[PDB]
Amino acid sequence: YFQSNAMELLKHLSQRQYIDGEWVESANKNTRDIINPYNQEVIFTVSEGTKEDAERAILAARRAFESGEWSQETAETRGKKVRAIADKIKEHREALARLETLDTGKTLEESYADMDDIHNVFMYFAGLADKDGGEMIDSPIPDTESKIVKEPVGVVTQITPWNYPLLQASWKIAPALATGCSLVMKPSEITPLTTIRVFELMEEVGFPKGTINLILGAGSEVGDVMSGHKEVDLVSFTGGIETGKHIMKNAANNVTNIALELGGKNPNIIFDDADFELAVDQALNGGYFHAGQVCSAGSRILVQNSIKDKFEQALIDRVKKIKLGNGFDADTEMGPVISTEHRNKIESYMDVAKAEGATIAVGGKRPDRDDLKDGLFFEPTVITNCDTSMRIVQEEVFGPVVTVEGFETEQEAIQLANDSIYGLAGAVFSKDIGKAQRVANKLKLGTVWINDFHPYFAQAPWGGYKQSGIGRELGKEGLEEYLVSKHILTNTNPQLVNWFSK
Amino acid sequence: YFQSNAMELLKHLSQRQYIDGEWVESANKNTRDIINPYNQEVIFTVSEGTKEDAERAILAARRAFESGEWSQETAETRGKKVRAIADKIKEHREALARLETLDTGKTLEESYADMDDIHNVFMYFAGLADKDGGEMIDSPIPDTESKIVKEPVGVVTQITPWNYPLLQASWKIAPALATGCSLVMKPSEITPLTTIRVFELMEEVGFPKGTINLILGAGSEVGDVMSGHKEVDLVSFTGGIETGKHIMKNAANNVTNIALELGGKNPNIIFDDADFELAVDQALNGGYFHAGQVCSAGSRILVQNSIKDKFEQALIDRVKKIKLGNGFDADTEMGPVISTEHRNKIESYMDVAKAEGATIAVGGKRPDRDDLKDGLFFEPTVITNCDTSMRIVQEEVFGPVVTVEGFETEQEAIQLANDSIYGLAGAVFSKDIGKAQRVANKLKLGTVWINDFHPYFAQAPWGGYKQSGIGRELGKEGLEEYLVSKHILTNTNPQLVNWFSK
Ligand SMILES: [Cl-]
Ligand SMILES: [Cl-]
Ligand SMILES: [Mg+2]
Ligand SMILES: [Mg+2]
Ligand SMILES: [Mg+2]
Ligand SMILES: [Mg+2]
Ligand SMILES: [Mg+2]
Ligand SMILES: [Mg+2]
Question: How far apart (Å, rounded) are the C-alpha atoms in residues A179 and A479?
Fold first, then answer.
C-alpha cells in the first residue's frame, strides 16, 4: 500500500507559503490544484502567491540579512545547521521519495536514489561552510596589509524546475545557507510537494526569521519580482532558455548577478570500439531515465557509421521491451511525463520530425494499454534518418525521445556533438581511453563522461557552456556564487602625500 | 619641449583599426578627430569603424580561438608573451605617459605612475598564467576518476572607458591573453591613442592572426554587436551604468557572460580621531586626482560633526591653492576635464545642487585665467550643507567636485556611507584601528582603505558591490572571469546497469 500511504502523508503536509517565519496563505487567497501524472487526479491544493507576497518575502530576507543573525553566525555553526537538514532528509528518505514519485511520476527507485543524493549535497556544503574565509595578499606597497574577505552576497532568489524539484532545491539552498545568505525560493507551480516538505524540515532545525522563505505558484509578475526587485543580490534560475533570458534582462535593471542553468542537447557519442553491450545499455539509460526529463538526458545519439545499423536494431529491440507504469509499482522502468502541456509539447515536436522527413523507428505516440490510459504516458521513442539541420536534432524536446545520427571519424563526431546552441553534458563511449580523452577535451560541455552516462555529485561543479547557462552549481564553484570579495587595505604607516600646495 | 615631442610621436602612430592581423581603415572610410582637452585642438584623426568591422573582428577572434594556435599554446609560453608586452610598456614608458597626458589631460606625473602600474599588471598576469590548470576531485563513485579542467572561455569583447584608457585596457588584455582567449577591444571614442599604441607593441611581440583585434569609435550599433553577437562568450565592460545595463540586456539574447564595472559614489569617512592633517591631504587627493575622474575618486566626504567646521575650513583653504594647468607643466596639480559633453554634464549637475539648496563653498565654475581659457577646465569644487536625499550626493558626477556631510556616530557613518546605489570603494580615517576595522567590515564596498585613499594593484581583486558592477578585475578572481570549468569523469570499470528489460 505504497501509493495510498503516500496519499495519507499529504494529510499532514502544509498547503501554505512560508514567509518571514510564518506559514501563510496567498495575499488574495488563490489556490492551485496539484496533479499526479500517473492518473491525472488532483492530489493536493496549495496557495498560489501574489507578487506582493514575493515582495514581502524579499524584504524580509533583506531585513534578516542586515540583522546579521544568520549572516554573522560563525561558519562552523552554519555548517552544523546545514548538516541537521541533511540528517532530516535521511530520516525522512522514504516519505520524501514517495512524495516525489507522487508529484513527479518517476519510479520509487529513482526517487530513493535522488533522496540519497540530496542528503549528500547538504552534507557536502555543511562540510564546506567553514573551510575558506578569504586570503592574505602580499601587498606591493610597503607598510600596508592587504586582505580579501569573503562575505555572503546577500539576498538570493531561487527558482527551481519540475524535473527533480527537491534535488534542484538542495543545490541552491545548501550553499545559500552555508554562506549566510537569506533566500527566497519558488518551486515549479506543478511540483511543490517535496519543497514544502523540506521547508517544514528546515523550520524544525530553526533559522532566524526571514532567512528562508517559500513562495508558491506562477502568479502574475511573481517571476518578475524575483528577478527584478532592487533588494535581490543574486538570481539563481534553473529552467527553460526563454524564461532564463527574460530573467537575465530583468536582472539587468538593478545590476543583479545571475546564475542560470537552461537545458541541453546532450550528446552520447558511441565509437565502433566501444563495449557494444555497454553502449546500448547506456543509450537506453541516457534516453529514458525519468522518461527523458532529467537534465542529464542523452537525447542525441551519435554512432560510428560502421556499427550504426547494428546499434539501431539493438536499441530499437530493447526500446520495445521498456515497461511503462505507475512509479510505485516495482516492475515499472519508466513513468509518465509531467504535465498535459509538456506531453502536448512533446507531441508537437513529433509533428516537426514528420514535417522534416525523419523516421519514427519505434514509439512516437501515447500508449493504449488500459492501465496507462488515464495517465500522462508517452512511448519511448527512437528517431532515425535525421541530420543536424533538423529541428528535432537541434531543439530540446525534454521527453522519452532520442535521435540517432551517424559519423565517420573522430573529427566528425566532435563537430556534430558541438553543433548545437547548448553545452551542458555528454558522453564518449570507447575502449580507446586516449581517444575518449581527446574527444572530451574538444567537446564544449560542462561535464563529459567517459564510458558512463548521467553522473553528477556535490563534489564537482555542474553547469553549461554556451546557451546552457551562466555559472556553476555544486562543488566549490557552486559555493562561490553565493559569496562576494572585499579587499581591505590598511596603511600601517600613513604619510601625507602633499600633492596639492599648502 | 615635452608637449611638442609628444605631438611629433603622433607622426608615427597608426590611425587605423587592427583586425585579423592587419591594420585597416573603417569599412566606410569614416574618421573621427581626437582632441587635446588642454586647448581643445584636434591632435589626431583615426578610423571610425562600422558594425560590419566589429562583426568581422569577432568572427576572426572565433576562427583564431578554434584553430588552437593561442588557446592550445602552453600556459608557460603564453606567460612569456604577456611578459614581453610588460617589458615593452616599460621600455616605452616616457612616450606612453606623454601620449596619455596629450589624450586625457592628466599630469605627466600621474601618467608616469600609471605606466608603472600597467607594467606591473602585465607582469602579474604573465606570472599567473601557468599556476592553476584545474583540480583533481575525490570522486564519491568507486572506480571513477574525476577532474576539473580550466579552459579559456573563448571570444571576449572588451570595452574600456576614457578614464585611464591604457590602464583599463591592461586589466582586460592581460588575463585574456594569459588564459588563451581571443579578444576584440574597443576603447573610448574620445581617447584611443595609447590603446592604438599598445596594439602596435603587441604586434611586435607577435600573436596568431585574430587573437587580438582593435575596433575604433562609437559607430552605429558597434556596441550592440560587441555585446550581442552569438559568437561572443564574455563581454567585459567598464563605463557608465546606463550603458552597462543595456549591454547586459543585449548579452542575455545569447546567454553571454558579463563582467561590468559601472562607477561609484565612493565615500571618504573621517572620524574626529583621525590624523587631521592626513585626512585633509587625503580628502584633497580623493576628490581631485585626475580632476575627480579616476574611478577611485572620493566625492562623498563624511566627517564627524565634532570637527566638521574645522575640516570644512581647512579643506576650502587648500582647494583655493590647487594649481590648474597643462598636464605637461611640472607645476600643474590638476588638469582639465575630458570633453565638452563631460564638462557640460558637470555644469548641469551644479544646476541641480543649486536647485536642491546646497552651498558651493568654493569653485563651481570654469576658471577665467587667460592660459586656461581655451581648455576644458573646471575649478575644484567643495559643496556643503547637503544631505543624503539630494541628487548631488546620490548621483555620480565624475568631476573635480566633493560634497561634505556630517555624522554623529560610527553607526551613522556606516548608514550614510552605504546609502547609495553604488558600492565600489571607500575609505575610513581613524587612529582607532579597531574602529576602522569594524567600519570596514560593515561597508558594502569592493575595496575599503583604512587610513589611505586610492590604492589598487594587480595582486588584489577590484570591483563593485551593488550597482557598481558584476565580477572582479585583477587578482586571481580577475583571471577566473576568462576561464570555464569542465568536469571530465571517467568510469574505469564500466558495467551494464541493466535497468531496462532485455
Ligand atoms: Cl575512430
Ligand atoms: Cl566615533
Ligand atoms: Mg508534521
Ligand atoms: Mg611584507
Ligand atoms: Mg547587484
Ligand atoms: Mg613604429
Ligand atoms: Mg580513490
Ligand atoms: Mg555564452
Answer: 7
